[PDB]
Amino acid sequence: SIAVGMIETLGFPAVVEAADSMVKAARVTLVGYEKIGSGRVTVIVRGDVSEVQASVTAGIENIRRVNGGEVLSNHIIARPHENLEYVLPIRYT
Amino acid sequence: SIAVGMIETLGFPAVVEAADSMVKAARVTLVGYEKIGSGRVTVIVRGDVSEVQASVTAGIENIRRVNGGEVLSNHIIARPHENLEYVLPIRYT
Amino acid sequence: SIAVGMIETLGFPAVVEAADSMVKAARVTLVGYEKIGSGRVTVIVRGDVSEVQASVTAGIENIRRVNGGEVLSNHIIARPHENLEYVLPIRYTEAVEQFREIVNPSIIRR
Amino acid sequence: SIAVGMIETLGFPAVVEAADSMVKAARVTLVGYEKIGSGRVTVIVRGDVSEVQASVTAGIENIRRVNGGEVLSNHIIARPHENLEYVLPIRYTEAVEQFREIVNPSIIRR
Amino acid sequence: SIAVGMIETLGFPAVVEAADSMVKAARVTLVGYEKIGSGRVTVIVRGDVSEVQASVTAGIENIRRVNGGEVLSNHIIARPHENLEYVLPIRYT
Amino acid sequence: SIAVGMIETLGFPAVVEAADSMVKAARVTLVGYEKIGSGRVTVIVRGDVSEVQASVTAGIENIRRVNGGEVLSNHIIARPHENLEYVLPIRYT
C-alpha cells in the first residue's frame, strides 16, 4: 500500500513504453516524469505494494522489446514518508 | 485510439531531417521534439497506427543518409494509455 | 546544532530512495532537491547536526541497495541558528488543540 | 527550388567560422543558429540547392582549420518554394535607387 | 571595481560547501554560482583583494573534506575590467 | 566588418581571466559570453584585426596562470560577413 515504483532509462522512447506497460499490467497510476540530463529519464507510478511490483517488472520486460531501449535503474519503495509527498515529484503535481 | 510514434536521434540536423520526413510521408501530426541530454532528441508524432508506422519507417530510412546522423532509439505504441497523455509530453502543444 | 546534509547521486531513482531513508532514519526535514544536469541530483535535509549525520549516513547506505543507483558526493554543512516555522495542514487541527490542553501552564516544578 | 544547409559542430568558435564560411563561399542566407546542449551547436543556411551544397561543403572545410573545432553532423533538407523577403537597412537606400534606374520598364524585347 | 573570487567545483554538494566556507571566512559578497555543464559549478564572490584571497583559500581547503567533491578551477582577479561587469555574471544579480 | 575574437575554455574561472586579459591588453570590446554545454564557455571580443589578435594572444597566455585553466578553442575572423551580425551573438547591442 502507498507504494512508489519508478524506472530510469537511457533514451526517451524506452521510458514511454515503460510507463505504458506499468499502468496497463496493474492498477497503478503514472504520476511523474522526471529528466535529470545525460539521457536519463524516469517515470514514477503509485499504487499498492503488490501492484507496483508487477507493473515495474512489466515495464522492464517491455523495454527489452524497444529498439535501442536500455534500463539504467529501477526501484520500488514499500511506503515512503509523508514528507516525501510534499517535496519529491512522487505525487500528481 | 490514436497511436504514437517516436524516433530518438543523436544531433540536431538529423532531428530536423526526421521531422521533415515523418510528416511528408504520412498523414500524422507533429507534437514536437523532446531533449533529454547528451544530444538525444526524440521527434514525436501522433496518428493512425498504419499512418504512424509509415511515418516512423520513412524517418529512420532518411537519417541513414544523414552524414553523422544516427538513430539511437525508435518505438511505436498503437494504443497508448490515457494516463500517459497527461504525464508524458505526447500531446500537441 | 542545526545543519544541512546533502547527498548527490547519479540517477533519479537513487535520489528518491535516499531522501526517503534520510527522513525515516532521523528527525530531519527534507528541504528539497536540486538538479545541476548530467544526471546529478542532490537531496538536502535539515535538523539537528547529530540527526543530520545519522540521516546522511543511512542515505548513503540505502543507495547501495538500489538496482542501478550510484552515489556521487555527500557533505554536511553547519548552519547558524534561526527561528524555524512549521505550518501544518488544517486536517491536523485536532492534534494542535489536543496537545495545547495536555501542556502544563506552570513552568515552575511543584 | 531551395534547400536548407545545416552543420553541427562541437564548440562555439568552430560554428562561428562555419557560419562565416557558408555565407561567403556561396549565395545563401544564414537563417538560424540553434543549440541543443552538451556542446553541440548548429548553424542553418538557406538558398538555392546548388548554392546550399557549395555552402555546406565550404563550411566543413573551414572547421577542420580551426583548433579545437570538430564537425558532428551535417545535412541538406529540401524546402518548398517561398516568397522570400530581404529587408535592406537605410544605409543602402542609394543603392536601391541606382538599381531602379538600370531596370527596363518594358519586359518586351524592344 | 572590487576583486572577484571564483572556485569551480564538481557537483552541487561541493559547491554549497565552497559558498559557505567562503562567506564566513571573509567580508566577501556572495554573487552566486554559475552552471556551465558536466556538473561544473563555480561560486563567485566580490570584495577587497585581501578578503577574496583568504575567502578563496578557505573554500579550497574545505572541499578536500567533501566525500566526492573536487576543486576544478580557481582564480582571483584583483581589478576586473569595467566591461566585464556588463558581460560576465560577476555582479550582485 | 569589424574583426571578432573568441576564446573557448573548459571551465568558468579560466574564461573570466581570458576575458579580463583581452580587454586590458588591446583596444577591443568584450561583447558576449556564450555557454553551449559540456563545460564549454566562450568569451567574444570585437575590434581591429591587430587589436583582436593581441587579445587572443594575451588571453591564452594568461590562462596558464589560472590553477586549472584549459583552453579548448580559439579563433579570429578578420572580416566577418554582415549576415553573422544579426544571427550569431557577436553583436555589441
Binding site: - | - | - | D48, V96, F99 | - | -
Partner: protein, 128 residues
C-alpha cells in the same frame, strides 16, 4: 502590408503569373533578363540583366545574396522567380506552378501584353 497581399496575389494568380513568366522566358531564351516588379509609383513589371542584380548585391554587401543565386539557378520551364522592388525591402516571388509555365501560357491564351496589363491591374487593385 504589401508583403502579405503579394503572397495572396502569388497564390491566387498562380496560373496568370506562370503564363507571363513563360512569355518573358520566350523573348529572353538564354535568360539574359529577369522578370521584375516595381511597386513605385504603382505596381508594374520590369526587367533587368544578371549584371544589374549582382552589382546591386555587391553594393548592399550580400544582403540579397540569396536572391541573386535563386535567379541564377532556377529552371524557367518549371518554376517562376520574380523579384519585387519595394520601399527599402526586396521580395522574391518564387513558386513552382502545378502546370509548367509553358502550359499556363497555352491554357490562358493571352498575349504577353494582355498578361502584363491584367496582372498589373489586379495587383494595384489589391494594394489600393
Amino acid at each position: 502590408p504589401w508583403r502579405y497581399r503579394l503572397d495572396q496575389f502569388t497564390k491566387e494568380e498562380q496560373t496568370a503569373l506562370g503564363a507571363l513568366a513563360w512569355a518573358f522566358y520566350q523573348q529572353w531564351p538564354a535568360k539574359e533578363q529577369y522578370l521584375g516588379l516595381d511597386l513605385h509609383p504603382q505596381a508594374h513589371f520590369i526587367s533587368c540583366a544578371p549584371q544589374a542584380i549582382a552589382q546591386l548585391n555587391d553594393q548592399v554587401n550580400g544582403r540579397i545574396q540569396e536572391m541573386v543565386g535563386i535567379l541564377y539557378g532556377y529552371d524557367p520551364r518549371t518554376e517562376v522567380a520574380i523579384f519585387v522592388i519595394g520601399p527599402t525591402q526586396f521580395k522574391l516571388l518564387f513558386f513552382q506552378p502545378i502546370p509548367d509555365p509553358a502550359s499556363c501560357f497555352a491554357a490562358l491564351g493571352l498575349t504577353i501584353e494582355e498578361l502584363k496589363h491584367r496582372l498589373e491591374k489586379t495587383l494595384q487593385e489589391k494594394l489600393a
